[PDB]
Design an enzyme around this catalytic site. Structure first.
Site, PDB file in Angstrom:
ATOM      1  N   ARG B  54       0.769  -1.064   0.057  1.00  0.00           N
ATOM      2  CA  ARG B  54      -0.127   0.020  -0.101  1.00  0.00           C
ATOM      3  C   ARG B  54       1.064   1.222   0.156  1.00  0.00           C
ATOM      4  O   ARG B  54       1.943   1.182   0.916  1.00  0.00           O
ATOM      5  CB  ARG B  54      -1.089   0.146   1.138  1.00  0.00           C
ATOM      6  CG  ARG B  54      -1.239   1.165   1.705  1.00  0.00           C
ATOM      7  CD  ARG B  54      -2.426   1.128   2.803  1.00  0.00           C
ATOM      8  NE  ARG B  54      -3.306   2.365   3.313  1.00  0.00           N
ATOM      9  CZ  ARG B  54      -3.167   2.886   4.190  1.00  0.00           C
ATOM     10  NH1 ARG B  54      -1.840   2.715   4.811  1.00  0.00           N
ATOM     11  NH2 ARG B  54      -3.593   4.275   4.075  1.00  0.00           N
ATOM     12  N   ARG B  95      -6.460  17.464   6.953  1.00  0.00           N
ATOM     13  CA  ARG B  95      -5.247  17.122   7.625  1.00  0.00           C
ATOM     14  C   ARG B  95      -4.377  18.559   7.970  1.00  0.00           C
ATOM     15  O   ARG B  95      -4.904  19.378   7.808  1.00  0.00           O
ATOM     16  CB  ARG B  95      -4.444  16.151   6.445  1.00  0.00           C
ATOM     17  CG  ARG B  95      -4.856  14.897   5.953  1.00  0.00           C
ATOM     18  CD  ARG B  95      -3.963  13.813   5.454  1.00  0.00           C
ATOM     19  NE  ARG B  95      -4.660  12.590   5.610  1.00  0.00           N
ATOM     20  CZ  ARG B  95      -4.219  11.648   6.512  1.00  0.00           C
ATOM     21  NH1 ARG B  95      -3.024  11.976   7.115  1.00  0.00           N
ATOM     22  NH2 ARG B  95      -4.757  10.621   6.636  1.00  0.00           N
ATOM     23  N   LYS B 248     -13.077   2.745   1.201  1.00  0.00           N
ATOM     24  CA  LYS B 248     -12.735   2.819   2.465  1.00  0.00           C
ATOM     25  C   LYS B 248     -13.886   3.359   3.075  1.00  0.00           C
ATOM     26  O   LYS B 248     -14.289   4.395   3.040  1.00  0.00           O
ATOM     27  CB  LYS B 248     -11.252   3.617   2.665  1.00  0.00           C
ATOM     28  CG  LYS B 248     -10.241   2.868   2.041  1.00  0.00           C
ATOM     29  CD  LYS B 248      -8.941   3.969   2.255  1.00  0.00           C
ATOM     30  CE  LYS B 248      -8.647   4.226   3.665  1.00  0.00           C
ATOM     31  NZ  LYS B 248      -7.322   5.011   3.788  1.00  0.00           N
ATOM     32  N   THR B 306      -5.686  -1.319  10.413  1.00  0.00           N
ATOM     33  CA  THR B 306      -5.422  -0.264  11.272  1.00  0.00           C
ATOM     34  C   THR B 306      -5.213  -0.498  12.620  1.00  0.00           C
ATOM     35  O   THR B 306      -6.436  -1.351  13.224  1.00  0.00           O
ATOM     36  CB  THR B 306      -6.464   1.111  11.355  1.00  0.00           C
ATOM     37  OG1 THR B 306      -6.408   1.557   9.854  1.00  0.00           O
ATOM     38  CG2 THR B 306      -6.019   2.100  12.273  1.00  0.00           C
TER      39      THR B 306
HETATM   40  K   LIG Z   1      -4.457   7.926   2.795  1.00  0.00           K
HETATM   41 MG   LIG Z   2      -8.830   6.792   6.926  1.00  0.00          MG
END
Ligand SMILES: [K+]
Ligand SMILES: [Mg+2]
Ligand SMILES: O=P(O)(O)OC[C@H]1O[C@](O)(COP(=O)(O)O)[C@@H](O)[C@@H]1O
Ligand SMILES: O=P(O)(O)OC[C@H]1O[C@](O)(COP(=O)(O)O)[C@@H](O)[C@@H]1O
Ligand SMILES: [K+]
Ligand SMILES: [Mg+2]
Lengths: 501, 501, 501, 501
Positions: B54, B95, B248, B306
């Site tokens: 990834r 972010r 996702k 995760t």
């Molecule tokens: K990402």
């Molecule tokens: Mg995420």
């Protein structure tokens, strides 16, 4: 609807015309049998759904059985369809005797005190009845006072009230109204008569049947694996190794030794008429469900028999209990249902076969909802069996019109039949003995075809034969199994899902 | 033991040597990357069980991602094994920002009142933090007083106590001790920021990844089927139709629209880090079991991700809860488990992959006893699916060492994988794109082979390739499926059970 | 929602205030304990859902443990809620010694060379780590060069590289960066140190704990039933027969002897920290599911422990893996979940209890859909167990708000809890020892009441107690069980379905 | 063993003695009924297991029915055992008329030509058969040439070959040998005779029966719920609200309206004789299994009827199919099995009851292994039903000798019986109407007791009554249910597990 449950139809005078005279007509027996007309009647039964004919050697002599067997051969040609030939033996049994002076029965009415002779090779008077015991055993010392002597499937009961040593006669009292008739089963429950593992009459009858050409033998009163093994030896010695043996379970000993008998035999015939007298009548249903489950688990053939459409011997319609019994036998998981007097001796032989076909066809539709058999619990004990499980999975996953197997000996067909797939099973085989041999397996449609060569496409042949047989049409999905390639495959190793052109 | 559960390993500086300097060494970033040495490290990860790498476009620029992608190509050659290339996008996210004067963090200690700027394109001071909002949206009016601003997977919390209209700044109070770092996710729960279905940064990053050559795209924060469709359009327009898209799911909207997202996507990546902040943390386990069941039911790929071995970022051994989480993800029915910081940023990248491989391999052994997935409940919706069910039946009926499929596009392999057979699945394919494309499917071992001609024996090729791959030995039983014959078969239509020479 | 899954919280300095100072503040240890302020902090953990507090005797001394237990008694009065008291023994273990001088710990880097002393009765220094071996054993001859010495749940690894016979010291190399703190557990895998049957230190600690007043003992490293029996003898001898023993399974010998251990004990604590180092880490999940099923089948209590919310020691939110672990433990069928460092040593003790309560409460809601436990397979071995099965049947048949049991010893409550009914279980008992004794049983709400007389309406009392508890309101349906009448009844023999007035 | 499956026995001349003469003896009908001798014969049927006697009003007249009912009351005193009284209505049916002169019947041969009159109010002759059509309807215009007229459960078939408009007569040909007796049911398949809502004759017969005192009514040919409701109105109007109505399903209209019929009625009688002629005979087994499941699900009573032991009318032993039918009806889940001609018309009425009891008792033993009914699928729709589910759970959990219910109206007993517990059900009731009313419920032993006062121990009474009944002995385990306390309880709310002293 193709009828998955097989029908065994007992043949006899009812479909047999002699001198143009029907069964029951005066002077009928004196005439010579009319083969072609009698053959046409049998062909209707074949078209109605009979998959095998049973010849009961308990009654007719070799000339009668042999001519009847020859007639069925013409019937197959007239019908354009082959059927199995099954021979039923006399076995370690007791049967009855003739009367003096032109008498054929006495109005045996309840309450009288009368006699039954044990002296072998003789005949009867109204006050004294003779037992034609198979072979010629002397059972006088085997039967104690208080025992019951039953005549004609238990239709008439005799209580042994005393024993006369001077004549070796039983003094009995009639328990109820009935008929004493020749070659009638006589049951004497809770009695240890030591009959032979294989009587000479049975040995001779079986050899005669083998010479004529038969596919199955139903062995009356199998008490142990030995009774099966003795017959197996005769089949192998005569070069008739292809013959399948169905053990008839009709007494406590056969039930006690069921696991050993199943292992020795190719199948079981649940002979309820004798069983219901030899054992408590209320236990026969328990034994019937258990025997069907065990035989299926062994990948063998099970036949349910006796009194299935009994009323149809005299009437055109069966009772509610008769329809229920045929329906439940199919639900219990039977491979085949059987007709005795209804087809052999009755006034409605063709109607009896058609009625049984209708109930069997209706019941097959409810196997998914009510069916007792459970293929899911079986251990898959071989690669062909793994394939049979896989075929059943395909039939459950999607709508499969037909399962086709190219089988040399019928092994793959038997395992697929064992799994009870939601589809008819076309068994493509290369010889007449294998073809006739598969006729009592649940859902199997045997079909003769040329042995395949290394250059043939077996999948194309399977589709072509299924189409020729009228079992599939364009757009239908079928599952085909074979050992590919021919000449290198050790066993059935290939499953193909194909849509018919 | 062949590892059926696939591993996605996030790459980064941890395995990357620059100028002979390791990650964390002073002056490391100033050096040029050492490709061959860095390639050897990656090859160990491949040998350890990584099935796909990834590349998180949330962090490194195109030159960094492109060189890393080039290094993995040499690693495949060194390892002698191919892996998948997966691109993870930034998505409709927020972010963080850089600090003035050489600072990299402030000892953000609990209780103080400080500020977060909404002004786009700027940088931070200890009393005022700047949000590099993806693209450049102004979220000042989207966030009300009482909302929570969380920094670094929720590691640090900021409560909005007031809003200053003059500067468009949030006045916040530090809720607990932590670190404010660049390119760090910032979560602002219960906030309706209207981000674009596809940001230009994402469009450009995806095009760059497509030019490099990738097999999968993980789309951050999919809220609707539209987010997937926009990426699908770019893949199709560029001639990259082979690329698979994993949505996702990391917010309530993605969860609310899960059925539509699954239909549009080729799979789902359960992005637990953002999801556990965006939705109640205690509901993530409920969503994880439900998503795995749904994706499997659709014959699509599911990745659990995760914090799986989070402690392994700093220590050589994971916690009891980390091992439990990896074990349970496999039991829940996951196709793949993922490593992020453990492989990208940590001190034990190879150890993390080996540890995950060990747990995944141990858990696969308990799928029969504890496994949540239920193939029995699925509708078999096509003839290839009927075959996949039949293959699963064969693997349950007897001991099957390997299932081999000759698959042109990988469809048969995906359906067989969907059924979770008790066997490894060797997928024999004819092009590199199909081969790499099957790398995240449960139990699938993709292998490149010449496209078969009409005169080839595909069963012989399957056995030969399986033997070459070292997956089977003489006496092993394998199930082989193919569309026979080549050039006439419309689909996989044949299943063969074969014993290896 | 009432939290059915019980919480065990390890106490320590984290909830303690010394002279108005919090844990992690200078001079904290040189201040007297603020008992009232400490008690107030503990009451919050009780309010948040801690059902029992764990006192680890491996740490500190009798005065610290005794003072902490007195503070908990004060906290029970402040909260108006009672909790269980659990003592955790040292057992046949190795612990790091106190350090010479002020130091409580030292940090070490990978590759550093230090020594480990075997001489007993001495303190450690940074360069020479001393061990407190149970029974004061000399382990020098038991440990060869090449063995690994692990400190604190295997967080720090030490490799033996040489042995100095002159000082009986091991020369070791630090394998990873880590800390060596005083009184930390030491594991030396693949060694066979001959620990004694019951160390005198354990006999002292247990006798000291019984004198303070405890309800449970968790016995560390139970190897065989004898380990449980020795502790049982002390509890019985001192008139503390009411104390329940939880065997801690943390090594291969305990796993191997699990059936005999479960039979001897009142329950099992799955001590994953030592177990994960003593046995392959990947096997802990297999052992956890199996232990939970076996203890539940035995009608005993199972506690899952260690690293459940490990990140919450330093942070306000747990990792995704940590939340998964707590949720899966509830789904597996655990009676209780435990906090160690999170409640004894961390910055977020109250938050840790609250977070675990929240996950446990959510997980209980998914037991119907995903619960591993299967009460249907149990043999009902007694009349009270038959009543427990009938109560679960009632809770399955209709919406039951609460199950109320009037139990003198808690046996009926244990049996109802074993069955995992879809309802809370109010256990009305007549003494505080029975009441505290039921605090770790799944779904049981222990409540003290007067023992009913033979003229009392037990059904009326049950409703009144449930109503005063605020557990039910008018129209709620409840199931009540009791032994009626009092004084004639030998066991719970009656079930009543009652609608709250 | 107590026989759980109930038996309904149709009474008639078979159990009747006239002037010291048995049925089937000359001048029997010209002698007065020997009431005491007839009562003694009936008491034997009660002792043998008949739970209810059926009075078919299609036969004879009010004096014969009234006298027979009085004899049964005498028989109850002689046996010291009570039975239910069931009246079977004529309904919208066609029956053959009385014959002119002495004749009760005539025999006919296949091919004979006779006539069937449509004129009402006249007697038949051998050559012209008259019909009693319900409502005195003229069916001449409703029957076309080619229709089939069947007599006596379809035993004899008549084909309409011409219609004579001058006399409104049908010219018919006998299709099979058979008998045409007076008052025999006539079926004309594929015709739509417009029968009235409730014939005045049925209103009279029902009112006459209610005056004598009956507990049940079987309504012939129920087509819709209105058929049940009309009878219900008469029962209610006369103060006979306690009478239970069993709808007889014997035609397509009843099958089509089964759900509404079951809702209106207290139960269903599967009247297979007419149903097998009205609908395809092969479908009766499908309908029987489906009706039994639906009635049981409704908590109502189902009776399977007709031809169950048909051969026992003339012989002492039933056929294998007959025994199979009774056994399968029990396995299907029937509350009761019925005898018609076997008990009313045959030579073996007592033997017929005894044989059915024996089969029913054996079949009950196989319910666990083969029973079709599945109480697990039921929705528990009330608190009493939840108690019934809990009682079955207790009987599954341990060996329960007896279930005892103290029920004012029998509701609790009906609900317990619906659940098919593995135990006999002793229903302690306080009035004879409730007691007789429960006689056809599966496994219920109705017993009259004094209504308990609020100071009585109901649990003690239950044990004492079970002990006096000889149903239990010391050490037996019993489940007792009651509404406690009397006067406060609104329903059965309590279950007690008690060991017999
Ligand atoms: K990402
Ligand atoms: Mg995420
Ligand atoms: O797979 P199994 O049960 O071991 O059977 C293998 C045997 O079956 C056979 O294939 C027979 O099968 P068919 O008669 O169906 O062709 C034999 O050739 C072979 O030896
Ligand atoms: O059986 P389905 O599910 O309808 O699939 C059929 C399709 O799958 C394919 O066979 C692809 O299968 P492979 O990629 O596994 O060879 C296509 O050629 C065909 O159109
Ligand atoms: K015979
Ligand atoms: Mg026989």
């Amino acid at each position: 609807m193709n009828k998955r449950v097989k029908i065994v139809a007992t043949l006899g005078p009812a479909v047999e015309i002699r001198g143009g005279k029907k069964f029951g007509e005066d002077g009928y027996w004196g005439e010579k049998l009319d083969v072609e007309a009698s053959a046409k009647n049998i062909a209707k039964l074949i078209e109605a759904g009979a998959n095998t004919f049973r010849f009961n050697f308990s009654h007719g002599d070799h000339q009668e059985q042999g001519e009847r067997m020859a007639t069925v051969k013409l019937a197959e040609k007239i019908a354009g369809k082959k059927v199995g030939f099954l021979l039923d033996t006399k076995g370690p049994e007791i049967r009855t005797e003739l009367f003096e002076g032109e008498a054929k029965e006495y109005s045996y009415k309840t309450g009288e005190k009368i006699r039954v002779a044990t002296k072998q090779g003789i005949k009867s008077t109204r006050e004294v009845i003779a037992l034609n015991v198979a072979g010629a055993l002397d059972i006088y010392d085997d039967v104690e006072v208080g025992r019951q002597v039953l005549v004609d499937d238990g239709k008439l009961g005799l209580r042994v009230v005393a024993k006369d040593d001077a004549t070796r006669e039983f003094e009995v009292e009639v328990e109820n109204d009935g008929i004493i008739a020749k070659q009638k089963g006589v049951n004497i429950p809770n009695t240890k008569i030591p009959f032979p593992a294989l009587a000479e009459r049975d040995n001779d009858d079986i050899r005669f049947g083998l010479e004529q050409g038969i596919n199955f033998i139903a062995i009356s009163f199998v008490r142990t694996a030995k009774d099966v093994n003795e017959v197996r030896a005769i089949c192998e010695e005569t070069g008739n190794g292809h013959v399948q043996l169905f053990a008839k379970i009709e007494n406590q000993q056969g039930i006690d030794n069921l696991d050993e008998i199943i292992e020795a035999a190719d199948g079981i015939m649940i002979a309820r008429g004798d069983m219901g007298i030899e054992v408590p009548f209320e236990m026969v249903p328990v034994y019937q469900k258990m025997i069907i489950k065990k035989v299926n688990a062994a990948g063998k053939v099970v036949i349910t028999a006796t009194n299935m459409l009994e009323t149809m011997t005299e009437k055109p319609r069966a009772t509610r209990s008769e329809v229920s019994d045929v329906f439940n036998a199919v639900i219990d998981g039977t491979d085949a249902t059987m007709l005795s007097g209804e087809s052999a001796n009755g006034k409605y032989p063709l109607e009896s076969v058609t009625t049984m076909a209708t109930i069997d066809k209706n019941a097959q539709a409810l196997l998914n909802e009510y069916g007792r058999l459970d293929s899911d619990s079986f251990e898959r004990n071989s690669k062909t069996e793994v394939m049979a499980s896989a075929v059943k999975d395909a039939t459950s996953s999607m709508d499969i019109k037909l399962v086709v197997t190219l089988t040399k000996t019928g092994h793959t067909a038997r395992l697929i039949s064992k799994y009870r797939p939601n589809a008819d099973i076309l068994a493509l085989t290369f010889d007449e003995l294998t073809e006739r041999g598969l006729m009592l397996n649940w859902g199997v449609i045997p079909m003769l075809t040329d042995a395949p060569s290394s250059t043939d496409d077996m999948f194309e042949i399977a589709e072509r034969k299924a189409v020729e047989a009228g079992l599939v049409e364009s757009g239908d999905d079928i599952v085909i199994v074979a050992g590919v390639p021919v000449g290198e495959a050790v066993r059935t190793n290939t499953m193909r899902i194909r849509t018919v052109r």
